[PDB]
Ligand binder design. Structure first.
Ligand SMILES: *O=[P@]([O])([C]C1=[C][C]=C(C([N])=[N])[C]=[C]1)OC1=[C][C]=[C][C]=[C]1
Length: 241
């Protein structure tokens, strides 16, 4: 997250850190039940040097605040039993960029570990709405990741505007969120983590999933996120959640 600030400890207890064997933190995820996480499909695509699609080559850290303190009170470490990537995911366009991660053993909810509510299929997060992104990604483009979980408040962008800012790249599965003036944005390493919509009365919903962007925090280049309401039935079908 570029242009954000340190989260309070336990402030985003649904935020998860996913480490690939021998590489440290690669992507985020969100806790949605004791056994399941939501993340981005593109994080789990093999490359020539490493099988990111192999669930056994991941470790999930639940209840984490500081990447240098992974044995701190509150942290629950888990392996993945499986990675369900969306059937329509396209690694060229990043359409349908969403995956479901099954933990090998369930999380136990605590002050540091708690699920985020899913939005139902009819839920709308209208253009203009201020919502939050969190993660341990780069805090500057080309920079390095954050040790301490970062948070940044960003706004949903109109879809026609989004399409035009990133021409021939936006599908209905995607949403731009950020500022047209840049400054605050997700960045490398935030992928797969949640957009958290915090309402005045304490209702909190996951609005989307960090997916991709053109640079980070540039003007007229807001981050692109996977919309979550459209996937409510797919999540129910595949996980029971
Ligand atoms: O999801 P990622 O962190 C890539 C990414 C880049 C930029 C934005 C943005 N809003 N400007 C969002 C997402 O995935 C990666 C890629 C390489 C290494 C680790 C994670």
């Amino acid at each position: 997250v570029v242009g954000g600030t340190d989260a309070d400890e336990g402030e985003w207890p649904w935020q998860v850190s996913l480490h690939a064997l021998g590489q440290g933190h690669i992507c985020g995820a969100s806790l949605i039940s004791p056994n399941w996480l939501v993340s981005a499909a593109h994080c789990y695509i093999d490359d020539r040097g490493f099988r990111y699609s192999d669930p056994t080559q991941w470790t999930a850290f639940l209840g984490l605040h500081d990447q240098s303190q992974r044995s701190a009170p509150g942290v629950q470490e888990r392996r993945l039993k499986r990675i369900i990537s969306h059937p329509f995911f396209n690694d060229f366009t990043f359409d349908y960029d969403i995956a479901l991660l099954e933990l090998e053993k369930p999380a136990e909810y605590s002050s540091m570990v708690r699920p985020i509510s899913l939005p139902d299929a009819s839920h709308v997060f209208p253009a203009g709405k201020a919502i939050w992104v969190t993660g341990w990604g780069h805090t500057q483009y080309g920079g390095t990741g954050a040790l301490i979980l970062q948070k940044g408040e960003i706004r949903v962008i109109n879809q026609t505007t989004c399409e035009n800012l990133l021409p021939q790249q936006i599908t209905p599965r995607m949403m731009c969120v950020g500022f047209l003036s840049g400054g605050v944005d997700s960045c490398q390493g935030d992928s797969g983590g949640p957009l958290s919509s915090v309402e005045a009365d304490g209702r909190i919903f996951q609005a989307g999933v960090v997916s991709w962007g053109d640079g980070c925090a540039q003007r007229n280049k807001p981050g692109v996120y996977t919309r979550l309401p459209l996937f409510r039935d797919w999540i129910k079908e595949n996980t029971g959640v």
